[PDB]
């Protein structure tokens, strides 16, 4: 896994690869690892990937409790203490790397947040075995204040970095923009590997393989 | 119906006939025995709250006689009613702020500091073995979007917004008053003049407390002596 | 246990 | 006025009283008559044992709490014992702690914060039984005495139970000799305000008589039967 | 990880590297180590961050509450105590050593180390993380009683540099802050700004 | 409507004189102490001729050294029973000796007041029990009987006699009970006073009796042997 | 009136009788009164003795809660005594929470919850007890606290609690308190005591004297016996 | 290794408005074989299978403690539970057991109940879910049947092309498995019907 | 721990009578009118907003549970906002096992099975409110009502609150199957004029709808303009 | 873990 943000002029650019693997082999090629957290709050998952996936839900189901009872939008300061205090509480089992990423009313927010429940509030982050290829992208070429399709293209290159120079990243590179005006979830952005070309054909006629036992039962 | 009651529906929260609740109504009743009346009004630039101080004795130490109380830096109250009960509600408002920064990490929005004090005495309205608290919250603060903001909660466990609002003895009158002057289309002075004519008083700067909160200076503020007279004689002199 |  | 306030320990009476606790002191006015007095040195306990039948053995009086502890029973047995049980395991906690006898004003404090409890809530009793204490300890001889309520008293001199108005006058009589008494005369002294307490018929016997010593040379001991014998004869008056 | 904090008279300086590490990878560069927990009272972090980020918002929400219910504002020593407390109860199971300092109208500017175990000392000036070993020489030959402010915060950022310098587990920006009864003031000490000292080349 | 705790201006529990109110529609049960044993004689009172007289049971063994006669409301006595057997049984397992007499009415006492509706941690007591016990034994006190009610009292009796004709047998007993009378005198004047207070005609089936002596142990009396003591009448 | 069975019930005047009827007993209590002054608080007891076989010191009405708190109590004894465990445990655990004496105002508003929480509910009864707490230090001055049965609390520099309350108030009330040392007032508390006392109903009763100021340093402490029968002297040639 | 103590492999395959679900029949313990007609693949509506590979222990309480859940589901709400659904509650019951789980990892086949639109998927065995567009796999031999589908696997296949391309990729990786094997079962689930075959197949 | 015994029971008769003296507080609170038409569902109720005082979009009797379900109520308010709040809490319980949102139907069950609790559980009394709930699944709405005995019941169109009984007489003469939401909206602001007294504005009534696109409340300036042509 |  490759995930990585970075706040822009505007808003926040969230990005990811899309490989998930059991040991050294590829499960699954194309896995969503940008979570809705709420309209205005997405978050990357890196780690093991049940926990990702049952710790942002749970956050995002509480966050739209507390936004139903308040009226208002919800912040990235309250995700952020939701997650860390949850993730302290587990003393590091539960494996969860995020990258926080969204808009409020006091403008656009960043964090990172550890399994053991440390966060770092940064203007641009990584996490995921593929972190350090992406975090030389963000050192060689972040700049503040960076324009829209400046901050798309930075974080694709910046993921595109892990894919490439990672076993553990693959397959597609996911963004997620975010601005007081806007989202943009961009599943795909791009598919920078494609799986090569059938070149034989194995046409298993009909009779092929043979039958010991057989039961038909309709249905209504 | 009609004031109707069977079995225990005047000593227990269990309904009457009529389908009200008789110890809901006179924890209400107990708000008035303590004999003060308070008020309180909003403005597009601030909040204020506005009690009675009656100090009978003066072998009291008049600092520590006060219906006025700090909740958050930012979040102040006027308590009317009993006063054990009113402060226990303090306290628990304080707790339930205090909490809700530590886990969310911003400052508890009036609105829903209020809304938690009356969740937590509708519990005392459903369930038999306690009474209701005696007592009346009204919050002040500001918010960030939708300005100065006054707030009131009661024992039924009801609670609501208000332009101004009041509480105790004269809460009627007060209603009254107030409904009468913003029909129409200054927030300290409104205050202090609906509390004076309501009581047909005429005060003394020791003789009632003000609390403050403002746009430009949320922190809540209780006025000095010297600052409520300036007030008082800004208004005599009309 | 599968991993990203 | 009364039925409604006098069947729980909860329930206050309209002039400030809980008559669950005053029923509860009925049970040690009841009870056999014990005196309890002391000296510079001792501290005695004099206990009237009722039997209940010819051919009953007489109720213990006087129970050993630890080496420079006993005490004496009026009330109900059962709640003896287990008030008894209490002491005796505060004294063995000490013990074991600190190497050294549990205070007895310290121990006495005890009792009364225990014997509280139940007088504050719901469906509680209080202890009926009230004790005279006799210890010994850093302070000199001690004579202390608890109640239903949860009061205790620290004592020249007590007595509790039945017609014990006229030993406690008796000893009123003769308490300034007390201080100054040897052990004999303090025995004498305590056996003659408990004779008070007889119908005038009546005798002080070896069969009615529990004596219970603790002082400064001697450990908490306890003379019944035969061995009181000493003590009575003795036997000034008419 | 080195922290710092000094006493002067009127008020404390505190200073901290700005560098967080994952085995010798750098997963902050511009750590904020130095966190406010009332008006006028830090704390310097060092250890594990998970462990002193969690402690420091449990001492700051007791306190918090503490403040209110006083209608006062808090004690240095309170807020020490606090983080002493639970630093000292859990300390099986947390890796923190702490700095707390500030000042308060009773005992004016003051500094309480509570290192890993959990005791509590005052001190004139106090050191800790793991780049603290490099510098108790330096300190112990340059601390003078009676420093003004400003040598406080030369002095600080002087032995924080020089730490820097030597501990790979310490690095990057110099942050200080100064507090008094007139409020805090935070800055960065960045590049060229961080005091600099020859490597000692060869004649 | 009152709480099982609460006092009478008297200065009594309701629950525990009521309880005692119940002893007095038991059978009788004489205990009488002698230098050379114990004796326990109950009525059994028979209230139909197609019920099993063997299968009442109102004197039980505790332990070899220890009998016990029961009047009042009998069921309420099996925990009690019970409870006095496991405890000499514990007392025997952890100092290898024999639990005296008044030791095992003192562990069954304290049983005794601990009834209400509040502190109260399974489905606890409700209500005192509705039982009086003669404890008869022998320990290195010697012979020993001992009394017990619900108010939680106990107190050794040289004769003693529980249940409905309690005060009228108890007279008998000041009368012909002395300290050096023997076992078998004992035997026969309590089943003298039985008859005499049983609105039955007294029989073999209709009582029970039971002895503990310094030499032997505890000992239900056979039918046979019951006729041998009845002769003389 | 009706509706006067538990403290889980208003009555149809939004009373809490069980509130009223365990002030009661307070006020069928003996005198207790307590004045802070310029450098400190006095306390002193009306303690009616209703033996001469009682001890003299027996019943005492004066606690110390902590090394620096006193504790003046009115009532039923057995109620003050267990709140006097209450304010002491209080003390204690806020001293090893954070690290330093407890305020008395703090101290006062703990113990005031603690009073308010047995006026709700049918499970338990309120105390039977009204209480001062005095307390003096360098930092925070003088100190004198009051707390009845319904869990108000409040601070005072003259106040009186039990039978001959209004009695004691108005003498009070002619000190000039503010500009007094306590080696002043322990003599004017003697004073009033013995004013208020009906020496017809109920004869006999001990003083009893305690201080907490400058002059103990902070600590609260029992007045010393010569001073407490000067004092006693004082207040009985005064009456006569 | 916990998941080689049993065996086993199960797979499920996508095709043109059907799906396919296969599993080996072995029952064995570390190189005993105890039994060759062990069931793997449970049903949980008429369009609608789970096939578990695993520890055999859990394979069987999973299926049980799942069908306890869905069928009070089913009960509850007005309805034939969809396929998505039932891999939430999959989920669910086994992040339940996050700190000690179960040992199995299932794969899910059916068709929409109201729709018929295929569905596949598998599921970790912490219960994180995997929804794919053409095949998963599941258990000992799960590298010799990832090489098998992602050579044989095309689009849209009718059910008789679908049917011999999972047992095709069946029958030939478990070959390569010392402890998958003796047999294999298919159902074929569409519309209309349910097809269940036993393949001729290597019995060592 | 609070009183173990239930607090309603079984009068001779064989009536609960606490649930039936909670139907009275529900029959004295202000109107409530549901409307499900066709294409949606609306849900509309009078504000007893006596003072110019009040702050009128400070609280809000029409609340969303989820972003499909919606509820308004008649009775007493701080009950309504135990409810709201448990139907909230029920709804992302469901969704968190199940990632489908909560069933319209399987809500209403839920929060029924919560008021029946109160009806038999120690130490309290039932709800003094009935909940009217909308929602939109299954490409279909629904309306539906739970009691204080816990309940519930699928309308096409109801009221409930002051004044119910002639407010029913009033649907029923005037609801068709095929009415389309704007007709709904119009039939169910002129439902709750029959028993008004006032004069209406857009500050002292409340609307919601729900649709294909979700639950919300209607704004002001959207009731504003239903207002004209009532 | 991560450490300052
Ligand atoms: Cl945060
Ligand atoms: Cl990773
Ligand atoms: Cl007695
Ligand atoms: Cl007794
Ligand atoms: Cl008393
Ligand atoms: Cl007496
Ligand atoms: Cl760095
Ligand atoms: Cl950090
Ligand atoms: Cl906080
Ligand atoms: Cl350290
Ligand atoms: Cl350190
Ligand atoms: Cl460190
Ligand atoms: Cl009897
Ligand atoms: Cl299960
Ligand atoms: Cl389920
Ligand atoms: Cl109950
Ligand atoms: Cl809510
Ligand atoms: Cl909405
Ligand atoms: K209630
Ligand atoms: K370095
Ligand atoms: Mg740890
Ligand atoms: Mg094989």
Same mark, same amino acid.
């Not at chain 4, 006098?6 to 005053?22: F, L, M």
């Not at chain 5, 330096?138 to 310098?165: H, P, S």
């Not at chain 7, 069980?18 to 007891?45: H, P």
């Not at chain 7, 002059?215 to 609260?220: D, Q």
């Given at each position: 896994?490759?995930?990585?943000?970075?706040?822009?002029?505007?808003?926040?650019?969230?990005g990811?690869?899309?490989?998930?693997?059991?040991?050294?082999?590829?499960?699954?090629?194309?896995?969503?690892?940008?979570?809705?957290?709420?309209?205005?709050?997405?978050?990357?998952?890196?780690?093991?990937?049940?926990?990702?996936?049952?710790?942002?839900?749970?956050?995002?189901?509480?966050?739209?409790?507390?936004?139903?009872?308040?009226?208002?939008?919800?912040?990235?300061?309250?995700?952020?203490?939701?997650?860390?205090?949850?993730?302290?509480?587990?003393?590091?089992?539960?494996?969860?790397?995020?990258?926080?990423?969204?808009?409020?009313?006091?403008?656009?927010?960043?964090?990172?947040?550890?399994?053991?429940?440390?966060?770092?509030?940064?203007?641009?982050?990584?996490?995921?075995?593929?972190?350090?290829?992406?975090?030389?992208?963000?050192?060689?070429?972040?700049?503040?204040?960076?324009?829209?399709?400046?901050?798309?293209?930075?974080?694709?290159?910046?993921?595109?970095?892990?894919?490439?120079?990672?076993?553990?990243?693959?397959?597609?590179?996911?963004?997620?923009?975010?601005?007081?005006?806007?989202?943009?979830?961009?599943?795909?952005?791009?598919?920078?590997?494609?799986?090569?070309?059938?070149?034989?054909?194995?046409?298993?006629?009909?009779?092929?393989?043979?039958?010991?036992t057989?039961?038909?039962?309709?249905?209504? | 119906?009609?004031?109707?009651?069977?079995?225990?529906?005047?000593?227990?929260?269990?309904?009457?006939?009529?389908?009200?609740?008789?110890?809901?109504?006179?924890?209400?009743?107990?708000?008035?025995?303590?004999?003060?009346?308070?008020?309180?009004?909003?403005?597009?630039?601030?909040?204020?709250?506005?009690?009675?101080?009656?100090?009978?004795?003066?072998?009291?130490?008049?600092?520590?006689?006060?219906? %006025?109380? !700090?909740?958050?830096?930012?979040?102040?109250? /006027?308590? @009317?009613?009993? =006063?054990?009960? $009113?402060?226990?509600?303090?306290?628990?408002?304080?707790?339930?702020?205090?909490?809700?920064?530590?886990?969310?990490?911003?400052?508890?929005?009036?609105?829903?500091?209020?809304?938690?004090?009356?969740?937590?005495?509708?519990?005392?309205?459903?369930?038999a073995?306690?009474?209701?608290?005696?007592?009346?919250?009204?919050?002040?603060?500001?918010?960030?979007?939708?300005?100065?903001?006054?707030?009131?909660?009661?024992?039924?466990?009801?609670?609501?917004?208000?332009?101004?609002?009041?509480?105790?003895?004269?809460?009627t009158?007060?209603?009254?008053? %107030?409904? !009468?002057?913003?029909?129409?289309?200054?927030? /300290?002075? @409104?205050?202090? =003049?609906?509390? $004076?004519?309501?009581?047909?008083?005429?005060?003394?700067?020791?003789?009632?407390?003000?609390?403050?909160?403002?746009?430009?200076?949320?922190?809540?503020?209780?006025?000095?002596?010297?600052?409520?007279?300036?007030?008082?004689?800004?208004?005599?002199?009309? | 246990?599968?991993t990203? | 006025?009364?039925?409604?306030?006098?069947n729980d320990?909860?329930?206050?009476?309209?002039?400030?009283?809980?008559?669950?606790?005053?029923?509860?002191?009925?049970?040690?006015?009841?009870?056999?008559?014990?005196?309890?007095?002391?000296?510079?040195?001792?501290?005695?306990?004099?206990?009237l044992?009722?039997?209940?039948?010819?051919?009953?053995?007489?109720?213990?009086?006087?129970?050993?709490?630890?080496?420079?502890?006993?005490?004496?029973?009026?009330?109900?047995?059962?709640?003896?014992?287990?008030?008894?049980?209490?002491?005796?395991?505060?004294?063995?906690?000490?013990?074991?702690?600190?190497?050294?006898?549990?205070?007895?004003?310290?121990?006495?404090?005890?009792?009364?914060?225990?014997?509280?409890?139940?007088?504050?809530?719901?469906?509680?009793?209080?202890?009926?039984?009230?004790?005279?204490?006799?210890?010994?300890?850093?302070?000199?001889?001690?004579?202390?005495?608890?109640?239903?309520?949860?009061?205790?008293?620290?004592?020249?001199?007590?007595?509790?139970?039945?017609r014990?108005?006229?030993?406690?006058?008796?000893?009123?009589?003769?308490?300034?000799?007390?201080?100054?008494?040897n052990?004999?005369?303090?025995?004498?002294?305590?056996?003659?305000?408990?004779?008070?307490?007889?119908?005038?018929?009546?005798?002080?016997?070896?069969?009615?008589?529990?004596?219970?010593?603790?002082?400064?040379?001697?450990?908490?001991?306890?003379?019944?039967?035969?061995?009181?014998?000493?003590?009575?004869?003795?036997?000034?008056?008419? | 990880?080195?922290?710092?904090?000094?006493?002067?008279?009127?008020?404390?300086?505190?200073?901290?590297?700005?560098?967080?590490?994952?085995?010798?990878?750098?997963?902050?560069?511009?750590?904020?180590?130095?966190?406010?927990?009332?008006?006028?009272?830090?704390?310097?972090?060092?250890?594990?961050?998970?462990?002193?980020?969690?402690?420091?918002?449990?001492?700051?929400?007791?306190?918090?509450?503490?403040?209110?219910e006083?209608?006062?504002?808090?004690?240095?020593?309170?807020?020490?105590?606090?983080?002493?407390?639970?630093?000292?109860?859990?300390?099986?199971?947390?890796?923190?050593?702490?700095?707390?300092?500030?000042?308060?109208?009773?005992?004016?500017?003051?500094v309480?180390?509570?290192?890993?175990?959990?005791?509590?000392?005052?001190?004139?000036?106090?050191?800790?993380?793991?780049?603290?070993?490099?510098?108790?020489?330096?300190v112990?030959?340059?601390?003078?009683?009676?420093?003004?402010?400003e040598?406080?915060?030369?002095?600080?950022?002087?032995?924080?540099?020089?730490?820097?310098?030597?501990?790979?587990?310490?690095?990057?920006?110099?942050?200080?802050?100064?507090?008094?009864?007139?409020?805090?003031?935070?800055?960065?000490?960045?590049?060229?700004?961080?005091?600099?000292?020859?490597?000692?080349?060869?004649? | 409507?009152?709480?099982?705790?609460?006092?009478?201006?008297?200065?009594?529990?309701?629950?525990?004189?009521?309880?005692?109110?119940?002893?007095?529609?038991?059978?009788?049960?004489?205990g009488?102490?002698?230098?050379?044993?114990?004796?326990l004689?109950?009525?059994?009172?028979?209230?139909?001729?197609?019920?099993?007289?063997?299968?009442?049971?109102?004197?039980?063994?505790?332990?070899?050294?220890?009998?016990?006669?029961?009047?009042?409301?009998?069921?309420?006595?099996?925990?009690?029973?019970?409870?006095?057997?496991?405890?000499?049984?514990?007392?025997?397992?952890?100092?290898?000796?024999?639990?005296?007499?008044?030791?095992?009415?003192?562990?069954?006492?304290?049983?005794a007041?601990?009834?209400?509706?509040?502190?109260?941690?399974?489905?606890?007591?409700?209500?005192?029990?509705?039982?009086?016990?003669?404890?008869?034994?022998?320990?290195?006190?010697?012979?020993?009987?001992?009394?017990?009610?619900?108010?939680?009292?106990?107190?050794?009796?040289?004769?003693?006699?529980?249940?409905?004709?309690?005060?009228?047998?108890?007279?008998?007993?000041?009368?012909?009970?002395?300290?050096?009378?023997?076992?078998?005198?004992?035997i026969?004047?309590?089943?003298?006073?039985?008859?005499?207070?049983?609105?039955?005609?007294?029989?073999?089936?209709?009582?029970?009796?039971?002895?503990?002596?310094?030499?032997?142990?505890?000992?239900?009396?056979?039918k046979?042997?019951?006729?041998?003591?009845?002769?003389?009448? | 009136?009706?509706?006067?069975?538990?403290?889980?019930?208003?009555?149809?005047?939004?009373?809490?009788?069980?509130?009223?009827?365990?002030?009661?007993?307070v006020?069928?209590?003996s005198?207790?009164?307590?004045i802070?002054?310029?450098?400190?608080?006095?306390?002193?007891?009306?303690?009616?003795?209703?033996?001469?076989?009682?001890?003299?010191?027996?019943?005492?009405?004066?606690?110390?809660?902590?090394?620096?708190?006193?504790?003046?109590?009115?009532?039923?004894?057995?109620?003050?005594?267990?709140?006097?465990?209450?304010?002491?445990?209080?003390?204690?655990?806020?001293?090893?929470?954070?690290?330093?004496?407890?305020?008395?105002?703090?101290?006062?508003?703990?113990?005031?919850?603690?009073?308010?929480?047995?006026?709700?509910?049918?499970?338990?009864?309120?105390?039977?007890?009204?209480?001062?707490?005095?307390?003096?230090?360098?930092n925070?001055?003088?100190?004198?606290?009051?707390?009845?049965?319904?869990?108000?609390?409040?601070?005072?520099?003259?106040?009186?609690?039990?039978?001959?309350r209004?009695?004691?108030?108005?003498?009070?009330?002619?000190?000039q308190?503010?500009?007094?040392?306590?080696?002043?007032?322990?003599?004017?508390?003697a004073?009033?005591?013995?004013?208020?006392?009906?020496?017809?109903?109920?004869?006999?009763?001990?003083?009893?004297?305690?201080?907490?100021?400058?002059?103990?340093?902070?600590?609260?402490?029992?007045?010393?016996?010569?001073?407490?029968?000067?004092?006693?002297?004082?207040?009985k040639?005064?009456?006569? | 290794?916990?998941?080689?103590?049993?065996?086993?492999?199960?797979?499920?395959?996508?095709?043109?408005?059907?799906?396919?679900?296969?599993?080996?029949?072995?029952?064995?313990?570390?190189?005993?074989?105890?039994?060759?007609?062990?069931?793997?693949?449970?049903?949980?509506?008429?369009?609608?299978?789970?096939?578990?590979?695993?520890?055999?222990?859990?394979?069987?309480?999973?299926?049980?403690?799942?069908?306890?859940?869905?069928?009070?589901?089913?009960?509850?709400?007005?309805?034939?539970?969809?396929?998505?659904?039932?891999?939430?509650?999959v989920?669910?019951?086994?992040?339940?057991?996050?700190?000690?789980?179960?040992?199995?990892?299932?794969?899910?086949?059916?068709?929409?109940?109201?729709?018929?639109?295929?569905?596949?998927?598998?599921?970790?065995?912490?219960?994180?879910?995997?929804?794919?567009?053409?095949?998963?796999?599941?258990?000992?031999?799960?590298?010799?049947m990832?090489?098998?589908?992602?050579?044989?696997?095309?689009?849209?296949?009718?059910?008789?092309?679908?049917?011999?391309?999972?047992?095709?990729?069946?029958?030939?990786?478990?070959?390569?498995?010392?402890?998958?094997?003796?047999?294999?079962?298919?159902?074929?689930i569409?519309?209309?019907?349910?097809?269940?075959?036993?393949?001729?197949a290597?019995?060592? | 721990?609070?009183?173990?015994?239930?607090?309603?029971?079984?009068?001779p008769?064989?009536?609960?009578?606490?649930?039936?003296?909670?139907?009275?507080?529900?029959?004295?609170?202000?109107?409530?009118?549901?409307?499900?038409?066709?294409?949606?569902?609306?849900?509309?109720?009078?504000?007893?907003?006596?003072?110019?005082?009040?702050?009128?979009?400070?609280?809000?009797?029409?609340?969303?549970?989820?972003?499909?379900?919606?509820?308004?109520?008649?009775?007493?308010?701080?009950?309504?906002?135990?409810?709201?709040?448990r139907?909230?809490?029920?709804?992302?319980?469901?969704?968190?096992?199940?990632?489908?949102?909560?069933?319209?139907?399987?809500?209403?069950?839920?929060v029924?099975?919560?008021?029946?609790?109160?009806?038999?559980?120690?130490?309290?009394?039932?709800?003094?409110?009935?909940?009217?709930?909308?929602?939109?699944?299954?490409?279909?709405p629904?309306?539906?009502?739970?009691?204080?005995?816990?309940?519930?019941?699928?309308?096409?169109?109801?009221?409930?609150?002051?004044?119910?009984?002639?407010?029913?007489?009033?649907?029923?003469?005037?609801?068709?199957?095929?009415?389309?939401?704007?007709?709904?909206?119009?039939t169910?602001?002129?439902?709750?004029?029959?028993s008004?007294?006032?004069?209406?504005?857009?500050?002292?009534?409340?609307?919601?709808?729900?649709?294909?696109?979700?639950?919300?409340?209607?704004?002001?300036?959207?009731?504003?303009?239903?207002?004209?042509?009532?």
């Amino acid at each position: 896994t490759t995930i990585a943000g970075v706040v822009y002029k505007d808003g926040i650019v969230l990005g990811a690869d899309t490989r998930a693997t059991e040991g050294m082999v590829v499960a699954d090629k194309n896995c969503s690892k940008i979570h809705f957290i709420s309209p205005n709050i997405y978050c990357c998952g890196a780690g093991t990937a049940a926990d990702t996936d049952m710790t942002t839900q749970l956050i995002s189901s509480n966050l739209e409790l507390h936004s139903l009872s308040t009226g208002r939008l919800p912040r990235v300061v309250t995700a952020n203490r939701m997650l860390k205090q949850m993730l302290f509480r587990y003393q590091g089992y539960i494996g969860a790397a995020l990258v926080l990423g969204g808009v409020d009313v006091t403008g656009p927010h960043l964090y990172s947040i550890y399994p053991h429940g440390s966060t770092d509030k940064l203007p641009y982050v990584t996490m995921g075995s593929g972190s350090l290829a992406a975090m030389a992208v963000f050192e060689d070429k972040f700049r503040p204040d960076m324009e829209e399709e400046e901050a798309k293209n930075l974080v694709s290159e910046a993921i595109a970095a892990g894919i490439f120079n990672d076993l553990g990243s693959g397959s597609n590179i996911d963004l997620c923009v975010i601005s007081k005006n806007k989202l943009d979830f961009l599943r795909p952005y791009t598919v920078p590997n494609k799986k090569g070309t059938r070149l034989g054909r194995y046409r298993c006629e009909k009779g092929t393989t043979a039958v010991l036992t057989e039961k038909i039962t309709p249905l209504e | 119906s009609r004031g109707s009651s069977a079995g225990f529906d005047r000593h227990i929260t269990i309904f009457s006939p009529e389908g009200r609740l008789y110890q809901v109504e006179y924890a209400f009743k107990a708000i008035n025995q303590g004999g003060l009346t308070s008020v309180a009004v909003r403005g597009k630039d601030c909040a204020v709250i506005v009690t009675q101080k009656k100090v009978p004795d003066k072998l009291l130490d008049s600092s520590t006689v006060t219906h %006025l109380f !700090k909740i958050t830096e930012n979040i102040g109250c /006027v308590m @009317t009613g009993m =006063t054990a009960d $009113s402060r226990s509600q303090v306290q628990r408002a304080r707790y339930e702020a205090a909490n809700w920064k530590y886990k969310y990490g911003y400052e508890i929005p009036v609105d829903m500091l209020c809304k938690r004090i009356a969740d937590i005495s509708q519990v005392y309205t459903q369930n038999a073995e306690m009474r209701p608290l005696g007592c009346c919250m009204i919050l002040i603060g500001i918010d960030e979007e939708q300005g100065p903001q006054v707030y009131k909660c009661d024992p039924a466990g009801y609670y609501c917004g208000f332009k101004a609002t009041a509480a105790g003895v004269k809460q009627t009158e007060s209603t009254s008053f %107030l409904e !009468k002057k913003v029909k129409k289309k200054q927030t /300290v002075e @409104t205050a202090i =003049t609906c509390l $004076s004519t309501v009581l047909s008083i005429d005060f003394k700067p020791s003789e009632i407390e003000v609390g403050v909160v403002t746009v430009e200076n949320p922190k809540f503020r209780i006025l000095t002596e010297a600052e409520i007279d300036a007030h008082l004689v800004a208004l005599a002199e009309r | 246990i599968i991993t990203x | 006025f009364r039925n409604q306030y006098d069947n729980d320990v909860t329930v206050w009476s309209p002039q400030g009283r809980i008559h669950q606790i005053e029923y509860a002191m009925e049970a040690v006015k009841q009870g056999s008559a014990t005196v309890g007095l002391k000296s510079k040195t001792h501290a005695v306990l004099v206990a009237l044992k009722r039997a209940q039948s010819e051919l009953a053995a007489h109720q213990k009086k006087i129970l050993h709490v630890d080496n420079h502890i006993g005490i004496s029973i009026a009330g109900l047995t059962a709640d003896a014992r287990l008030l008894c049980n209490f002491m005796r395991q505060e004294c063995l906690d000490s013990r074991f702690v600190f190497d050294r006898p549990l205070p007895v004003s310290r121990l006495v404090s005890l009792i009364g914060s225990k014997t509280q409890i139940p007088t504050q809530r719901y469906g509680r009793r209080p202890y009926g039984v009230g004790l005279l204490i006799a210890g010994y300890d850093d302070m000199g001889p001690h004579i202390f005495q608890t109640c239903p309520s949860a009061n205790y008293f620290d004592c020249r001199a007590m007595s509790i139970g039945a017609r014990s108005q006229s030993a406690r006058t008796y000893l009123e009589r003769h308490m300034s000799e007390f201080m100054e008494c040897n052990l004999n005369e303090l025995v004498k002294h305590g056996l003659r305000a408990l004779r008070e307490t007889l119908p005038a018929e009546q005798d002080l016997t070896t069969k009615n008589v529990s004596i219970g010593i603790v002082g400064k040379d001697l450990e908490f001991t306890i003379y019944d039967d035969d061995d009181v014998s000493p003590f009575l004869e003795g036997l000034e008056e008419r | 990880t080195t922290i710092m904090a000094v006493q002067f008279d009127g008020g404390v300086v505190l200073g901290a590297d700005s560098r967080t590490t994952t085995g010798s990878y750098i997963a902050n560069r511009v750590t904020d180590k130095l966190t406010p927990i009332h008006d006028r009272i830090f704390c310097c972090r060092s250890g594990s961050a998970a462990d002193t980020q969690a402690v420091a918002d449990a001492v700051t929400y007791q306190l918090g509450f503490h403040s209110i219910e006083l209608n006062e504002p808090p004690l240095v020593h309170t807020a020490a105590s606090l983080f002493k407390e639970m630093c000292y109860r859990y300390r099986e199971d947390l890796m923190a050593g702490i700095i707390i300092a500030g000042w308060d109208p009773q005992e004016g500017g003051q500094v309480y180390s509570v290192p890993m175990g959990g005791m509590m000392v005052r001190q004139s000036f106090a050191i800790g993380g793991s780049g603290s070993s490099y510098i108790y020489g330096y300190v112990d030959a340059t601390y003078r009683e009676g420093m003004t402010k400003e040598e406080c915060l030369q002095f600080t950022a002087n032995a924080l540099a020089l730490a820097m310098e030597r501990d790979g587990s310490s690095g990057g920006v110099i942050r200080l802050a100064a507090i008094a009864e007139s409020g805090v003031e935070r800055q960065v000490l960045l590049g060229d700004q961080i005091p600099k000292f020859a490597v000692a080349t060869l004649p | 409507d009152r709480g099982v705790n609460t006092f009478s201006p008297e200065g009594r529990l309701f629950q525990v004189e009521y309880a005692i109110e119940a002893i007095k529609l038991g059978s009788t049960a004489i205990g009488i102490q002698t230098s050379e044993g114990v004796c326990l004689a109950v009525e059994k009172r028979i209230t139909s001729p197609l019920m099993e007289p063997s299968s009442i049971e109102k004197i039980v063994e505790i332990d070899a050294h220890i009998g016990c006669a029961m009047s009042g409301l009998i069921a309420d006595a099996k925990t009690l029973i019970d409870k006095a057997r496991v405890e000499t049984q514990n007392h025997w397992f952890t100092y290898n000796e024999t639990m005296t007499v008044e030791s095992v009415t003192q562990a069954v006492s304290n049983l005794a007041l601990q009834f209400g509706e509040e502190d109260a941690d399974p489905g606890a007591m409700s209500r005192p029990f509705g039982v009086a016990l003669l404890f008869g034994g022998v320990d290195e006190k010697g012979p020993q009987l001992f009394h017990m009610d619900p108010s939680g009292t106990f107190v050794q009796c040289d004769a003693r006699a529980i249940g409905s004709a309690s005060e009228g047998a108890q007279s008998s007993l000041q009368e012909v009970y002395h300290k050096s009378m023997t076992l078998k005198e004992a035997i026969k004047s309590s089943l003298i006073i039985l008859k005499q207070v049983m609105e039955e005609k007294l029989n073999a089936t209709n009582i029970e009796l039971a002895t503990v002596q310094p030499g032997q142990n505890f000992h239900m009396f056979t039918k046979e042997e019951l006729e041998e003591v009845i002769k003389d009448i | 009136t009706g509706y006067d069975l538990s403290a889980s019930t208003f009555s149809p005047d939004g009373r809490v009788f069980q509130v009223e009827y365990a002030m009661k007993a307070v006020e069928n209590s003996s005198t207790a009164i307590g004045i802070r002054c310029k450098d400190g608080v006095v306390f002193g007891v009306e303690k009616l003795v209703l033996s001469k076989l009682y001890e003299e010191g027996s019943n005492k009405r004066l606690f110390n809660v902590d090394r620096h708190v006193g504790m003046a109590v009115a009532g039923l004894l057995a109620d003050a005594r267990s709140l006097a465990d209450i304010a002491r445990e209080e003390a204690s655990n806020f001293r090893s929470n954070f690290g330093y004496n407890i305020p008395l105002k703090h101290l006062a508003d703990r113990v005031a919850m603690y009073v308010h929480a047995y006026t709700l509910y049918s499970a338990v009864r309120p105390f039977g007890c009204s209480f001062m707490l005095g307390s003096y230090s360098v930092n925070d001055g003088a100190q004198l606290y009051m707390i009845d049965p319904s869990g108000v609390s409040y601070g005072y520099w003259g106040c009186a609690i039990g039978k001959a309350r209004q009695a004691a108030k108005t003498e009070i009330e002619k000190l000039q308190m503010k500009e007094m040392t306590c080696r002043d007032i322990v003599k004017e508390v003697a004073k009033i005591i013995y004013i208020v006392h009906d020496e017809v109903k109920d004869k006999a009763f001990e003083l009893e004297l305690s201080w907490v100021g400058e002059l103990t340093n902070g600590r609260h402490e029992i007045v010393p016996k010569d001073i407490r029968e000067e004092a006693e002297k004082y207040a009985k040639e005064s009456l006569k | 290794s916990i998941m080689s103590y049993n065996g086993g492999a199960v797979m499920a395959m996508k095709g043109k408005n059907c799906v396919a679900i296969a599993a080996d029949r072995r029952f064995g313990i570390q190189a005993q074989m105890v039994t060759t007609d062990f069931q793997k693949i449970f049903p949980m509506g008429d369009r609608l299978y789970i096939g578990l590979a695993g520890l055999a222990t859990d394979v069987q309480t999973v299926a049980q403690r799942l069908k306890f859940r869905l069928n009070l589901y089913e009960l509850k709400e007005g309805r034939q539970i969809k396929p998505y659904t039932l891999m939430s509650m999959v989920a669910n019951l086994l992040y339940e057991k996050r700190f000690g789980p179960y040992y199995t990892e299932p794969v899910i086949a059916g068709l929409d109940p109201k729709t018929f639109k295929p569905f596949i998927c598998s599921l970790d065995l912490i219960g994180c879910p995997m929804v794919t567009d053409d095949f998963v796999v599941s258990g000992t031999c799960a590298e010799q049947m990832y090489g098998m589908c992602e050579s044989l696997w095309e689009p849209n296949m009718d059910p008789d092309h679908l049917f011999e391309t999972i047992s095709q990729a069946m029958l030939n990786a478990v070959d390569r498995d010392a402890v998958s094997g003796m047999g294999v079962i298919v159902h074929i689930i569409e519309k209309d019907k349910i097809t269940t075959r036993t393949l001729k197949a290597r019995m060592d | 721990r609070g009183y173990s015994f239930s607090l309603t029971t079984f009068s001779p008769s064989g009536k609960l009578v606490q649930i039936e003296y909670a139907l009275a507080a529900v029959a004295g609170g202000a109107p409530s009118v549901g409307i499900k038409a066709a294409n949606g569902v609306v849900l509309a109720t009078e504000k007893k907003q006596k003072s110019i005082l009040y702050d009128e979009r400070s609280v809000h009797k029409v609340e969303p549970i989820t972003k499909h379900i919606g509820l308004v109520y008649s009775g007493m308010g701080p009950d309504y906002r135990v409810l709201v709040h448990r139907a909230r809490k029920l709804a992302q319980q469901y969704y968190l096992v199940y990632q489908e949102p909560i069933p319209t139907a399987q809500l209403v069950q839920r929060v029924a099975s919560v008021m029946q609790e109160y009806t038999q559980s120690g130490g309290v009394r039932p709800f003094g409110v009935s909940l009217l709930i909308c929602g939109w699944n299954e490409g279909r709405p629904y309306l539906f009502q739970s009691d204080p005995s816990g309940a519930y019941f699928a309308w096409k169109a109801t009221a409930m609150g002051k004044n119910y009984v002639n407010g029913k007489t009033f649907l029923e003469k005037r609801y068709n199957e095929d009415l389309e939401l704007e007709d709904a909206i119009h039939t169910a602001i002129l439902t709750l004029k029959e028993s008004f007294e006032g004069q209406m504005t857009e500050d002292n009534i409340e609307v919601g709808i729900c649709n294909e696109a979700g639950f919300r409340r209607l704004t002001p300036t959207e009731v504003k303009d239903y207002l004209a042509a009532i």
